[PDB]
C-alpha cells in the first residue's frame, strides 16, 4: 500500500494567503475574517532590523503604510496592532473563504503541512516536523515569510506555524499564530544559535509501526526492554527521551499491529546499536523521524478531510 | 534554503473529487464540467473482475446503478459511456469549481502530485514519479481508486494519472484521463508482472545539482567521463540510460551551478561504485530519483501558482 511524506490538502489555506507590503519589504499574510496576520519584521528597514524597537516602529506607522493585496484586489487596512511577533492588520473585508480554524502551539516532534508562498500566491505544499531544537527543516526562499504550517482535523484548520526567518545554517524559525517564537529566537538580525538537534524517538517508533503495517518485520526481534533502559540507550544516540505520554499516543498503533511499544523499543535499540546491515525500512536506509503516530494512522487508515 | 518532496497546492483538484458507487463498490471520481471520470472496474463484482467483458457489463448497467455524491449533494447520473478503461458519467450539474485543465499523458521519469482520496474526500497530497516500468510508488489504500495525479502550470491543472489498482508487490498502476493504462497493465484480476524497475538517472543528476545548490559538495570529484562510459557503468547498477536529450534538459542546472553534466555524471559514477561512506546528500543516504530537472528549478527558484 506504500508510505510517503504526505501533506494535508492545501485548499482551505490557499484561499487565506495574501501579499503584504510595507516600506522595502513584501512577504505573505494570512487573511482570516477581517484580519491579516503576518510577521511584524515587515515594518523594519534593513537598518531597523539590526536593533528594532517594534513598539516605537509601529507607533510611527499608519494604516496607509501597509499594502495588502488578495489576488488583484487591494484590501484597505483600517487598523493595525501587534501581538508578540505577529502583526495584525484589520482590513475592510472579511475573507469569504475563511475556513473553520484555530491557532495551536505545537510541541517539538509534532508535524504539520507547509504551504510555501511568494507574493501571496502558493508555490507548493510539503510535510515538516518541528525539530527538538525548535527549528524546522523547510524549503523556503526569499519572500516565503508569512507562509504557514497547519494540520487539519475534520473541517478545522489548526494553524501552528508562521515562517519568520532562515538561520545561517539554512534551517527555519518562526512563531505560532499568536506571535510567539518556537525556540530561543528573536526577530532581530543578531547572531542566534539553534540548540543541537536530536532525533524524535516517538516518531521513529511510529514509522517502524508503519513499516510493520506495510509488511516489513525483519527488525522485530526476540528481545524486550524497560522504558528506562531504552531511554538510556536512546540518549547515547542523540534521541529524545521516550515519555509515558509518547507510549500512550503510540497505543492505537500498538493495538492495530499487536506489537507493544516496549517491544518496538527493543527492536529500535538493536537498530541503533548494530545498524541496518545495508537493509532498508520503507525504502529508507536511515531511521525516519518526521512522521508522528497520528500521521501514520491517518495515512495507513485513509482518514479524509471535508 | 532546504529541499523537500514538494507537492503542488491541491485546492483546484480538491473541488473536483466526488464519490462514485456502483453495486457494492465505492471509489472516487473526477468531476469536471458535467462529467465524472472514474475507473470502469467500479462496475465489476469480485467474480466479474477475474475475466470482465466491459462492453457487456456496461450494456447491462443503467444510469440509476451509479450513485455520485459531491459532498452531501447527490449528483444524478443522466448518461454513461466508456473511454478505454475510464467510465464517463454525465451528471445533471456542471462542477462550479471546475478549474482550467488539460489531460496530458506523461512519460516515465516525469513527476506529479497525487491527491489521495477515499469516499470522494481528500486524505492527503504527495509527490510521485512515473517509474520506468510505468508503475508508481504511491501511498494508496482500499477505496483510493479514482484518485488523480496532476501538475499545475499557472492556473491550468494538467491531469496525468488516475489510480486503478495495486499490484501484489505493493506498487500502483493506472491510466491517463483518456483511460489508457500506463504500462502493460489491464483492469482484470489476472497475474501481471511489472517490468524490472530502474533508477531515473536524469533525476538523480537533477537532485545532485539540488544538493550542490544547497551546499553539499563532498561528492564532487576530480574525474570526468564520456556519456557512453557513464551509461556502461549505469547499466550495471540498474540505472536508465542517460540520453543527449537528458544532458540538454540538465543544461539550466549545469549553468546555475557551473558544474557540467558529464562532470556530475562522473561524480555519480563514483557514488555508484564506492557508495556514500556513511555520508548523506540532502539528508538522504540513498540516491533520490523522484525529482526532475524542472522540479529542482521550480523549488530552488520559487515558482508560484495562480
Ligand atoms: K520594511
Ligand atoms: K566530477
Author numbering:
A (entry chain B), B (entry chain A): 1 to 306
Please give me the paper's original passages concerning this structure.
SARS-CoV-2 3-chymotrypsin-like cysteine protease (3CL protease) also known as main protease (Mpro) mediates the maturation of viral proteins by cleaving the two viral polyproteins pp1a and pp1ab at 11 sites. Here, we report a new class of peptide-like inhibitors of Mpro identified using the commercially available DELopen platform (WuXi AppTec) that provides a library of 4.2 billion compounds (screened by the user) as well as the services necessary for the sequence to structure decoding of binders’ DNA tags. The identified inhibitors were peptide-like compounds containing an N-terminal electrophilic group able to form a covalent bond with the nucleophilic Cys145 of Mpro, as confirmed by x-ray crystallography.
As demonstrated further by x-ray crystallography, SLL11 was found to adopt a highly unique U-shaped binding conformation, which allows the N-terminal electrophilic group to loop back to the S1′ subsite while the C-terminal amino acid sits in the S1 subsite. Hydrogen bonds were also formed between the backbone of the compounds and Glu166 and between the C-terminal amine of SLL11 and Mpro Asn142 side chain. In this conformation, the N-terminal electrophilic group binds Cys145 close to the S1′ pocket while the C-terminal pyridine group binds in the S1 pocket. This C-terminus to N-terminus orientation is markedly different from the orientation of the natural substrate of Mpro and its substrate-derived inhibitors, which usually have the C-terminal amino acid positioned in the S1 or S1′ position while the remaining peptide chain and N-terminus extend toward the left side of the binding site. While both SLL11 and SLL12 were proven to bind to the active site of Mpro, SLL11 could also get enriched during the three rounds of the selection process when the competitive inhibitor X77 was added or the reversible covalent inhibitor GC376 (43) was preincubated (10 minutes) with Mpro. This proves that SLL11 was able to outcompete to some degree both X77 (IC50 = 2.8 µM) and GC376 (IC50 = 0.15 µM) used at final concentrations 14 times (20 µM) and 3.6 times (5 µM) higher than the concentration of the protease (~1.4 µM) respectively.
